[PDB]
Design a protein around this ligand. Structure first.
Ligand SMILES: [Hg+2]
Ligand SMILES: [Hg+2]
Ligand SMILES: [Hg+2]
Ligand SMILES: [Hg+2]
Ligand SMILES: [Hg+2]
Ligand SMILES: [Hg+2]
Ligand SMILES: [Hg+2]
Length: 1188
């Protein structure tokens, strides 16, 4: 992975940026050291209480003279401690605000310069850069990668310096307060980073191993879901379900292990930190007994050292964000610093005023930059006199267009020169070069605006009268004036779709507005109907007037009118001259003449569910039984520590027998280790209870999901929201994440209720008023913890929804780059981009202020909490209310328990995302289709007859109930006779075939098979004897024998049936000859096949089941030569003795049909045979006269 140097990345930082960064980091430094100072003042606080305990504990000395030396002493000490706590907090809000504000600010100001300079950099690039680069990743890189460079030069590094200031501040306060104890804890430290390091490598080994493990099942997932139509047709839903399942109990089982190791890792971490507590307290409290360190110092160095150590843990991801940001900026700064060969953005050449118009190509040797191994132009020599129209022909290769592309100087020639008049094309300015050169490309392109605005892109300073005039010159004035909103009518991609000739003529107007002295026409009339070609060419012929024109047309009808015809054979121009010469010489030209004669849309719709999801995992009780008790133990483990922590510092503050200090000390420290051991047990156990659970729940669930997915109707697969990728994504992620909302949530809710629950009872017995204070303060801060991520992600989505405006501009300008560069007008797009960007950048200031005051509001309060609880608590202890040990207990129970529920909440996956991903699963499963392929009801007769009849039957597609397809057409087909379906296009030529295959239910009317209604028949059995052949046949990546035998399921096909169906489809000759026989894989993973052969396989497939009805729907549209003969030759022998329905556009093979039905609109207007419908002189007579 690449990476820019650090110094290089902040290049766009100015005076104010460097100022903001230095001041921000300086605030982050002093903010970072606030917390350790808070621990120092906490130790100096506890030392004051430990003095008041031991005197009032043993016997009785002075009752009236205690209140002056104890009660009055602690008040005087706390009145200062409160000023220290509150002072520090008051500083915290200030420096935090400076920190986040200034950083988010300066970073934003740099990002604003970066995205702009990046966009200009892209526009500045030449077309050769676009040849080697995918535009798709380029367009997304402007949004994703710049937003990614934004993160990591913002608040992230302010928090990095804060975390490091906390590290250094913690170790400095540690060593400053204690020499030995800090060394002891730090001696325990290396065993943690080594443990965290090894366990992070273990699960990440299984994580990357899981991805290519399910990819095997996801392979058959998309293969089926893509081919589903052919699946439901052949009903292999049983076999495809089994095939999908076979790869499931292979992948997830491997995931079980990872789950377990992840829990073991977490348990190891807790064991080790608990061991650190036990050890540090064992040494510290043994150290206070020899009267070296005080009680407060042990707490001070322990807390400052721990905090300083965990500070690294909180500095790791922030520095990570900065790391990939430099990796992201390499690609972007590469494009910016890239200066193109053709600029094209400034003027450095000449701008001739003659401007004359003579074209010359002298010795042009050129090859494309993408493929340099192949040379296109080899010594091209071509001259065009003034105002002369030259046509290029020869059907050589890309070279024709290359000349056009060379002429507007998109590419510079490898050898030789293109000269307009006496000067080279390179000696003249590019912008001015393309202003004097007009171009009309093969595919017309209009931007999404008014017609007028599409014209303005041709030239900006155009008055409305000039626009109209230019439209009238383009014969486009007629239809524009018929448009509803006239010249203000929208066009382009979205809204108001126009026909190709109209779109092209608007473009011609656009080019005519620039008034170029040279006009280039590259396949202008191509890909157009003969009716629009007339008008477009009518405009073009009038656009060639007084201009030097070089024209390329595939259709040679419009070529002859040119002044000079130049032929292309290979890379060199051979024959050049007038029409009569090129006919008389019988060259290439003469040969050509004789031969041519959805993400957001998903999660929004589902309602529900609350705790219904647990029923999905309810298949396994025992795991949950052990899991709840387990989670209760690990949960009640936390209040235990609040007691034992208070008991250690309690033995040194509350006084008591010194001979019992050691005895108790070693008890409680050791106790902590026990407390660690048990915590290791829980995480080992939970991993075997909920850990397996959610995985089993996954496998079974995917199975279930997939089954229901095949149960679904075809109309459900037509729903735009359910795509093969969306279904495979639903199946891959949402199904597996459901476990986040089942057992994990019970674990979280039980560890939480055990912790804060039992802890609150304990703190309620040992404290009354203080407990009531903390259960007030804590929830208030918790809500602040919620609002923090509410206003953070809330204004984050708002910032993106206001950036989609620019994203549209840059997207449209990049996707059509090859078009805009021909019209210049790049700088115009830059202008529109900056104008679009000015709005979100004006909100960046307010953004920073809001983020600042919010971060400071969450953080400031935190210190003030301490300041409240300890002031009020000291007020409690100073009086008859006891004691201090219980103050510290209540505090540690409620507060550390509150943080503990936060950690537990951060363990489990996102419950919201889990429930929403769950709802899609429960809905996909409980989804009952109209037509059910799984039903075991139905008639199942003996009668092999097979008479097809459509009576009434009016249908319209459920996806788009606009313009019904069948308006009640009726027909009939008896056994052995073949039906023929004729019409202008599809709907409902193919809808008949789909309806007989029962993919849909018509709204009114009925379709009968024999004497029975179809709806009465068994669903699967109906399709059991229906042969279906589509326009593009598909095979499964299994094998050939399986493909052929895929025709008939629920039966052993064996060698005999496959060879028997092979020999009649005439495919047996292609099998033995190609190594090897039947074992070969089709396709794309095996040996490729031509359309004809694969189609013959598709025939053999539908022929195995011995169907009494064949449905042939536009069978071979792409088949050519003699390949089409043998296919239909194999169809004709298998059509005898069967009911057949043929849809073809050929109309040549329909003449032999028994019945020919012409279907127009929604009904049947013509019925009869070929000669019968021919002698009728109806619409069939109009359609069959185009055969000549
Ligand atoms: Hg920011
Ligand atoms: Hg080309
Ligand atoms: Hg547990
Ligand atoms: Hg379609
Ligand atoms: Hg259709
Ligand atoms: Hg297969
Ligand atoms: Hg047929």
């Amino acid at each position: 992975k690449p990476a820019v140097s650090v110094l290089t990345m902040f290049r766009y930082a100015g005076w104010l940026d460097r100022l903001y960064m230095l001041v921000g980091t300086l605030a982050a430094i002093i903010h970072g050291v606030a917390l350790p100072l808070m621990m120092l003042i906490f130790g100096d606080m506890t030392d004051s209480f430990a003095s008041v305990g031991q005197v009032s504990k043993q016997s009785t000395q002075m009752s009236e003279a205690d209140k002056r030396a104890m009660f009055a002493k602690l008040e005087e000490e706390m009145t200062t401690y409160a000023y220290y706590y509150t002072g520090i907090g008051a500083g915290v809000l200030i420096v935090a605000y400076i920190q986040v504000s200034f950083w988010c600010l300066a970073a934003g100001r740099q990002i604003h310069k970066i995205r702009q300079k990046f966009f200009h950099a892209i526009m500045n690039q030449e077309i050769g850069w676009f040849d080697v680069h995918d535009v798709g990743e380029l367009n997304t890189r402007l949004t994703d990668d710049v937003s990614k460079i934004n993160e990591g030069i913002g608040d992230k590094i302010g928090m990095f310096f804060q975390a490091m200031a906390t590290f250094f501040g913690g170790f400095i306060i540690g060593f400053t307060r204690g020499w030995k104890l800090t060394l002891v804890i730090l001696a325990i430290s290396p065993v943690l980073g080594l443990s965290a390091g090894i366990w992070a490598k273990i699960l990440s080994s299984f994580t990357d191993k899981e991805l290519h493990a399910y990819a095997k099942a996801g392979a058959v997932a998309e293969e089926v879901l893509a081919a589903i139509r052919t699946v439901i047709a052949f009903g292999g839903q049983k076999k495809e379900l089994e095939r999908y399942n076979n790869n499931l109990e292979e992948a997830k089982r491997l995931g079980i292990k990872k789950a377990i190791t992840a829990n073991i890792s977490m348990g190891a971490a807790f064991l080790l930190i608990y061991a650190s507590y036990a050890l540090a307290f064992w040494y510290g409290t043994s150290l206070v007994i020899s009267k070296e360190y005080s009680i407060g110092q042990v707490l001070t160095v322990f807390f400052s050292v721990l905090i300083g150590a965990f500070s690294v843990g909180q500095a790791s991801p922030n520095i990570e964000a900065f790391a990939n940001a430099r990796g992201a900026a390499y690609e972007v700064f590469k494009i910016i610093d890239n200066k193109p060969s053709i600029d094209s953005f400034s003027k450095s050449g000449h701008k001739p005023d003659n401007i004359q118009g003579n074209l010359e190509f002298k010795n042009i040797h050129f090859s494309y930059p993408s493929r340099k191994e192949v040379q296109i132009l080899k010594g091209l020599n071509l001259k065009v006199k003034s105002g002369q129209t030259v046509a290029l022909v020869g059907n050589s290769g890309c070279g024709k267009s290359t000349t056009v592309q060379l002429m507007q100087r998109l590419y510079d020639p490898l050898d030789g020169m293109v000269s307009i008049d006496g000067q080279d094309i390179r000696t003249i300015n590019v912008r001015y070069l393309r202003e004097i050169i007009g171009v009309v490309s093969q595919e017309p392109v209009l931007f999404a605006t008014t017609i007028a605005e599409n014209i303005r892109y041709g030239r900006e300073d155009v008055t409305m009268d000039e626009i109209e005039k230019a439209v009238k010159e383009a014969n486009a004035y007629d239809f524009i004036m018929k448009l509803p909103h006239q010249f203000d009518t929208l066009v382009g991609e979205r809204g108001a779709q126009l026909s190709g000739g109209q779109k092209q003529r608007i473009a011609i107007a656009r080019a005519l507005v620039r008034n170029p002295k040279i006009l280039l026409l590259d396949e202008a009339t191509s890909a157009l109907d003969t009716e629009s070609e007339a008008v477009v060419q009518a405009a073009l012929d009038k656009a060639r007037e007084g201009r030097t024109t070089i024209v390329i047309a595939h259709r040679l009808s419009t070529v002859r009118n040119a002044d000079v015809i130049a032929g292309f054979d290979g890379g060199v121009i051979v024959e050049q001259g007038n029409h009569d010469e090129l006919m008389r010489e019988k060259g290439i030209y003469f040969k050509l003449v004789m031969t041519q004669t959805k993400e957001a849309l998903d999660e929004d719709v589902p309602p529900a569910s609350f705790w219904r999801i647990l029923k999905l995992n309810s298949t396994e009780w025992p795991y949950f039984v052990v899991g709840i008790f387990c989670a209760i133990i690990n949960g009640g483990l936390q209040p235990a520590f609040s007691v034992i922590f208070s008991k250690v510092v309690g033995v040194f503050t509350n006084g008591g027998p010194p001979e019992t200090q050691r005895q108790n000390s070693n008890l409680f420290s050791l106790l902590f280790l026990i407390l660690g051991i048990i915590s290791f047990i829980t995480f080992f156990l939970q991993g075997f209870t909920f850990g397996k659970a959610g995985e089993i729940l996954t496998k079974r669930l995917r199975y279930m999901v997939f089954k229901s997915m095949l149960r679904q109707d075809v109309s459900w697969f037509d729903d735009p929201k359910n795509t093969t990728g969306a279904l495979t994504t639903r199946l891959a992620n949402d199904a597996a994440q459901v476990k986040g909302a089942t057992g994990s949530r019970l674990a979280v809710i039980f560890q939480n209720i055990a912790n804060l629950g039992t802890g609150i009872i304990i703190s309620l017995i040992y404290g009354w008023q203080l407990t009531l204070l903390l259960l007030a303060i804590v929830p208030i801060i918790a809500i602040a913890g919620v609002v923090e991520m509410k206003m953070l992600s809330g204004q984050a989505l708002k910032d993106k929804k206001e950036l989609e405006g620019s994203g549209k501009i840059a997207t449209e300008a990049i996707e059509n780059f090859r078009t805009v560069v021909s019209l210049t007008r790049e700088q115009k797009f830059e202008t529109m981009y900056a104008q679009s960007l000015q709005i979100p950048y004006r909100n960046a200031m307010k953004k920073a202020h809001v983020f600042g005051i919010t971060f400071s509001f969450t953080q400031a309060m935190m210190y003030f909490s301490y300041a409240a609880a300890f002031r009020f608590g000291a007020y409690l202890v100073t009086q008859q209310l006891m004691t201090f040990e219980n103050v510290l207990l209540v505090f540690s129970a409620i507060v550390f328990g509150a943080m503990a529920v936060g950690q537990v909440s951060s363990f489990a996956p996102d419950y919201a995302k889990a429930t929403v991903s769950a709802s899609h699963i429960i809905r996909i499963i409980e989804k009952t289709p109209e037509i059910d392929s799984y039903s075991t009801q139905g008639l199942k007769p003996n009668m092999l007859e097979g008479n097809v009849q459509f009576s009434g039957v009016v249908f319209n597609y459920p996806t788009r109930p606009s313009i019904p397809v069948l308006q009640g057409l009726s027909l009939e087909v008896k056994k052995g006779q073949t039906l023929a379906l004729v019409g202008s296009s599809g709907c409902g030529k193919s809808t008949v075939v789909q309806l007989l295959e029962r993919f849909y239910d018509p709204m009114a009317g009925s379709v009968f098979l024999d004497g029975k209604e179809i709806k009465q028949l068994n669903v699967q059995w109906l399709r059991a004897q229906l042969g279906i052949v589509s326009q593009e046949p598909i095979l499964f990546d299994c094998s050939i024998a399986e493909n052929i035998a895929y025709g008939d399921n629920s039966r052993v096909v064996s060698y005999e049936e496959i060879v028997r169906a092979a020999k009649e489809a005439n495919i047996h000759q292609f099998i033995d000859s190609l190594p090897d026989k039947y074992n070969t894989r089709v396709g794309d993973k095996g040996t490729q096949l031509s359309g004809g052969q694969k189609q013959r396989i598709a025939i053999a497939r539908a022929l195995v089941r011995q169907p009494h009805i064949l449905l042939l729907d536009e069978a071979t549209s792409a088949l050519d030569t003699e390949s089409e003969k043998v296919v239909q030759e194999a169809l004709d022998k298998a059509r005898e003795g069967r009911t057949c329905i043929v849809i073809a556009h050929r109309l040549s093979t329909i003449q032999n049909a028994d019945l020919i039905v012409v279907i127009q609109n929604g009904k049947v207007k013509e019925h009869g045979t070929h000669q019968q419908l021919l002698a009728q002189k109806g619409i069939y007579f109009s359609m069959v006269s185009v055969q000549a």
